[PDB]
Homo-oligomer: A and B are copies of this chain.
Amino acid sequence: TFEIGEIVTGIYKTGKYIGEVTNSRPGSYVVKVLAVLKHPVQGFHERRALAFREQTNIPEQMVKKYEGEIPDYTESLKLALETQMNSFSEDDSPFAERSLETLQQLKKDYKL
């Protein structure tokens, strides 16, 4: 169980975020996004991270109490993206190729 105002991590569409619980309901929480921990998987269309202060419904199983520091949203997004891009370093698949292309553009779209 999580109370309003509680700082949590949330997993949404393969992305992972730090956020704040702003409402509860049967089986889920509305989470206000504050930072990005993991940029979502792509695929061939792009898939954007949740935006700063975006509020999204997340099933309760995918929500966890978070007591760490809250990173700056923009710097966290920059980091999350570089991490995902680097994750393909030893990957010679077509999926890696297509993903890396996609993330490179997203990086420009985000203003980073």
Which of B4, B21, B52, B69 sits near A74, CB closer than 8 Å? B69
A107-B72 Cα distance, complex, nearest whole Å = 21
**A54–chain B nearest beta-carbon distance, Å:** 13
Do A53 and B70 form a contact, CB below 8 Å, given A5-B5, A20-B20?
Answer: no
**Is B4 in contact with A34, judged by CB distance below 8 angstroms?**
no
A52 to B67, CA, bound (A): 10
Query: What is the CA–CA distance of A74 and B72 in the complex, to the nearest angstrom?
Result: 11
Identify the interface centre among A5, A7, A34: most chain B CB within 10 Å of its CB.
A5
**A35 in the interface, Cβ–Cβ < 8 Å?**
yes
Contact check, B22 vs A5: say whether CB atoms are below 8 A apart: yes
A-B contact list, 10 entries, CB within 8 Å: A4-B5, A20-B20, A34-B69, A34-B70, A52-B69, A53-B67, A69-B72, A69-B74, A70-B72, A71-B72
* 19 other A-B residue contacts (CB within 8 Å) besides A5-B20, A5-B22, A52-B69: A4-B4, A4-B5, A5-B5, A7-B20, A20-B20, A34-B69, A34-B70, A35-B70, A53-B67, A69-B72, A69-B73, A69-B74, A70-B70, A70-B72, A70-B73, A71-B71, A71-B72, A72-B72, A72-B75
